[PDB]
Amino acid sequence: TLEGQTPIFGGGTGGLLTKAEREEKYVITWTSPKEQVFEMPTGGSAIMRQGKNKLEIARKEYGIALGGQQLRAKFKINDYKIYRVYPNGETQMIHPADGVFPEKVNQGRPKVRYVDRNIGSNPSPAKLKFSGVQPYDAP
Amino acid sequence: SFAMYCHNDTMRAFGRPQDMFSDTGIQLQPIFAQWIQHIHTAAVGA
């Protein structure tokens, strides 16, 4: 389970929907030095408590926006984490992936979907007809 | 409102004026506005 107390919020219509209970849901947890007012990702204002806070959200973009544009940029809070929660209770911590923010280079991170050429050297689609490979995926 | 206007168009094209929303067909009298007119006329004694 995920620990933390939910922020003071009187309710709203921008919360979770059937997708949260049927397909997936996200949880953003953080710690603040004091109780203070922030803006909910889907409208309205909530009050984050002094201890550790936990907020349920429908999309990962909500958590990314809240953590970056509000928690770090405004409240100087850097310990926020975003988890993906499945209906069967399985939870994976997805942000930050390896405990280091993605914008900061970290050793051990492999190159994914890297093309060893400039973009202007992609082959023409006439080369790869009926071969099933896109020009950007060509070797 | 607009689908009723289209209904009036189609009924008139069929040659069925009795089925139109009109003073001579299916009437839609604005009774509240008429009542306000009557009250405002009778307020001054006219």
Binding site: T6, I8, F9, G10, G11, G12, T13, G14, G15, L16, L17, T18, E21, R22, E35, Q36, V37, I47, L55, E56, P87, N88 | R16, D19, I26
Partner: protein, 172 residues
């Protein structure tokens, strides 16, 4: 310095969950509204799906006859207007039942998508099984036909019923 004043708020979070996209209002959570909605045939506790469908069908097929009787194109004559109203009610009910059948056919394949999945907690959509939907559809069809026929019989005998409700049948 910060006072949300949630404890004295007339409008509370729905069912104690502030993040379920709902509010506790006079429409959603008042005792009268809750009793009325939960005791409608779609939600009444213990009802079999067929009985729910039967009650809903009777009501809906009963009132669906009237509009074409009053403002339909056969309204110039009583018998034709009543026939047109009955036919309109029958057509609407049969179309709705076909829609219910195809909804049951397409929704319940494997684990249903959306609000009818096994892990869904939609309290407003309690019919979680295909067989319940088919029983409901049978009840809906039979009740709708019965209500439409009842309204048609009452309207066809309008003169007799008018004499009945005025004591005119007691002359002889």
């Amino acid at each position: 310095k910060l006072n949300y004043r949630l404890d004295t708020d007339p409008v509370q979070p729905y069912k104690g969950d502030p993040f379920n996209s709902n509010f506790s209002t006079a429409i959603t959570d008042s005792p009268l509204a809750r009793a009325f909605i939960n005791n409608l045939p779609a939600y009444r506790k213990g009802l079999t799906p067929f009985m729910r469908g039967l009650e809903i069908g009777m009501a809906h097929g009963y009132f669906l006859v009237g509009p074409e009787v009053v403002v339909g194109p056969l309204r110039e004559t009583a018998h034709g207007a009543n026939l047109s109203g009955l036919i309109t009610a029958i057509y609407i009910a049969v179309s709705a039942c076909l829609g219910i059948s195809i909804f049951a056919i397409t929704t319940f394949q494997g684990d249903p998508r959306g609000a009818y999945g096994s892990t869904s907690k939609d309290s407003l959509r309690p019919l979680r099984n295909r067989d319940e939907w088919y029983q409901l559809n049978g009840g809906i069809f039979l009740g709708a036909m019965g209500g439409a026929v009842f309204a048609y019989l009452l309207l066809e005998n309008f003169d007799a019923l008018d004499s009945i409700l005025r004591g005119g049948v007691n002359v002889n």
